[PDB]
Design a protein around this ligand. Structure first.
Ligand SMILES: C#CCN(Cc1ccc2[nH]c(N)nc(=O)c2c1)c1ccc(C(=O)N[C@@H](CCC(=O)O)C(=O)O)cc1
Ligand SMILES: C#CCN(Cc1ccc2[nH]c(N)nc(=O)c2c1)c1ccc(C(=O)N[C@@H](CCC(=O)O)C(=O)O)cc1
Ligand SMILES: O=c1ccn([C@H]2C[C@H](O)[C@@H](COP(=O)(O)O)O2)c(=O)[nH]1
Ligand SMILES: O=c1ccn([C@H]2C[C@H](O)[C@@H](COP(=O)(O)O)O2)c(=O)[nH]1
Lengths: 316, 316
């Protein structure tokens, strides 16, 4: 089965993972250096042993591909994955006149009524973003996110480089190149970032008319993150390929610090009692070729028969 | 035996490696995505199945650790690994009055007498570098090399960041961090570089009082390059550890495009007929702790009993 590597990584961490604490003060089980391989010609690696929302995955990837960094687009697509980051900037800034949200993410799990106040406060902020173009302009723009890291790298001369755009052009002109790399790591920015990119660097490769892609993830949440990441990068390996007119080869996920939060142990064991079903299948619109102009309707997932969704808490 | 992974990578490429040409127009056998693991507590990974020059490895690493980018230091240490790059800039510039060296690297293998002319021309340039401080200042400074990428990253504000310096400080204050990353990839520079860094990115990790390091190599010459690289990065994992007062764990070498030049096939097979001996041992000076102030005499390699050196041609 196509998703075996993910189960193995999960089992493995459970078995060889050494205890290791972190920022959130919640302990974890970590390993260092791992590498999975998913033959993308066998099917699309969307977990069948637990329901993963492909809709959110598409929304987020297209956002990146547009070089966009404002929440407004994602919001219009019912995507709220990046809300806390915008919200957090709104609460620590001027004008915010409302219940003190200091430590909203952490407290939400503990104070019940607080969760109520915060959830509506959030609901309001999002509405303002979504409608007040002025507000969106200053609170919905996350700044340094994958969208601007891949397609608008700031140069020392006050200019901008479209890493993804250029790399794609190169795949077309020099497929056998070894410099097909897109970095999301800027030494100038990381020192003062809310969250340096976990999806640190990827590189393309072409051989036998097939496109492959390797992603280097400095840090991974095996339960919550990895499941999205695989699908997210597997989608791109499909997009770029389609555009360049190659076939799809395999996705290679290399890990730095792969961990499993102690509060996710039961749930992950719960998933390990499942037997993966046949993998779903991606269907891309044949009329469109400019991935930069792709839309939600141009990507279709067929035969997605998963197990119910396994619920687990976000440990900040 | 400690170096088994390297043999396996070699055998593997020979067995699953698909043909793939490149810039030098010499064909290669490539694979995409590999990952070796060397437990550094078992010994120092310097190849015993073929003599590797640890002297050059030390010279080069210290050069990097000093944030230096000029050939003069390396020259004083009889190191000529980076000569062609300096020489190449001298020949394509003004003032060069002598035999046209256009395509010296490639031609050297073909025109015998040419090799003679070029070799002495080189000998002269190096002497000028080594003695004329003015000359060295403009022809010996390679510019963007690991030394300035690790310890003098140019920011958009015309400043400079000491990635290595800072990361080291972090290991001391926050060992369990997942942001211990040093990048040698600058999207602003790669577009116009003679050779973008093959040793693209490394990340540190600390657990159980042991320091580990993973290196991401976008491109590798399995015969000539990989042997140096392992030892080079294994030395650093030892240096930083010593400084931070941790123990050494393991070195993890992840590969993007790992290849074997077609003109190295015989020689690599030749090496595969060998049986690795016990690994050598690194001995660091206990009195010094500032790796930035380390010198050739502060690093000692014990029990290095290798097989003779296997000769193979440099395919540009
Ligand atoms: C993906 C991604 C990158 N990111 C950014 C990001 C930031 C910090 C992180 N912290 C940790 N430990 N793991 C992560 O996956 C993680 C991811 C995400 C951020 C939020 C959600 C999210 O809210 N959805 C969760 C929980 C939903 C809920 O509360 O019910 C989910 O399970 O999908 C998902 C991903
Ligand atoms: C190391 C490194 C990075 N580098 C930079 C660099 C640049 C282009 C490359 N090209 C290829 N195919 N492989 C490499 O290892 C390589 C390395 C090196 C550059 C030169 C030598 C060198 O001259 N020594 C060779 C050959 C010596 C000889 O001519 O006799 C050797 O075998 O050591 C070694 C390493
Ligand atoms: O695909 C993803 C994206 C983000 N994160 C996680 C990584 C860390 O658990 C946390 C960020 O903490 P640091 O690694 O930066 O310390 O967010 C993932 O696990 N997977
Ligand atoms: O440790 C090292 C350093 C450099 N090179 C090689 C990689 C490529 O063979 C060549 C550079 O060519 P590109 O990958 O940039 O095309 O130099 C290595 O193999 N190993």
């Amino acid at each position: 089965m196509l998703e075996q590597p993910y189960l193995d990584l999960a089992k493995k961490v459970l078995d060889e993972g050494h205890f290791k604490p972190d920022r959130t003060h919640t302990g974890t089980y970590s390993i260092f250096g791992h590498q999975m391989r998913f033959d993308l010609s066998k099917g699309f690696p969307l977990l069948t042993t637990k329901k993963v929302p492909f809709g959110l995955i598409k929304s987020e990837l297209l956002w990146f591909l547009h070089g966009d960094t404002n929440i407004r687009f994602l919001l219009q697509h019912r995507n709220h994955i990046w809300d806390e980051w915008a919200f957090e900037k709104w609460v620590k800034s001027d004008e915010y006149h409302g219940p003190d949200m200091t430590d909203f993410g952490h407290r939400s799990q503990k104070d019940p009524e607080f969760a109520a106040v915060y959830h509506e406060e959030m609901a309001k902020f999002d509405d303002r973003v979504l409608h007040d173009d002025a507000f969106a302009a200053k609170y919905g723009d996350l700044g340094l996110v994958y969208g601007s890291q891949w397609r608008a790298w700031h140069t020392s001369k006050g200019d901008t480089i479209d890493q993804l755009g250029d790399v794609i052009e190169q795949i077309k002109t020099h497929p056998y190149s070894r410099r097909l790399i897109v970095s999301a790591w800027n030494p100038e920015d990381v020192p003062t970032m809310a969250l340096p990119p976990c999806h640190t660097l990827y590189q393309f490769y072409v051989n036998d008319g097939k496109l492959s892609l390797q992603l280097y993830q400095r840090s991974a949440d095996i339960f919550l993150g990895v499941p999205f990441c695989i699908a997210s990068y597997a989608l791109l390996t499909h997009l770029v390929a389609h555009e360049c007119g190659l076939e799809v080869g395999e996705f290679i996920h290399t890990f730095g610090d792969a961990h499993l939060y102690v509060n996710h142990l039961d749930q992950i064991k719960e998933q390990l009692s499942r037997t993966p079903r046949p993998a779903p299948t991606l269907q891309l619109n044949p009329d469109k070729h400019d991935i930069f102009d792709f839309d939600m309707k141009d990507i279709k997932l067929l035969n997605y028969d998963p197990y119910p969704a396994i619920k687990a808490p976000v440990a900040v």
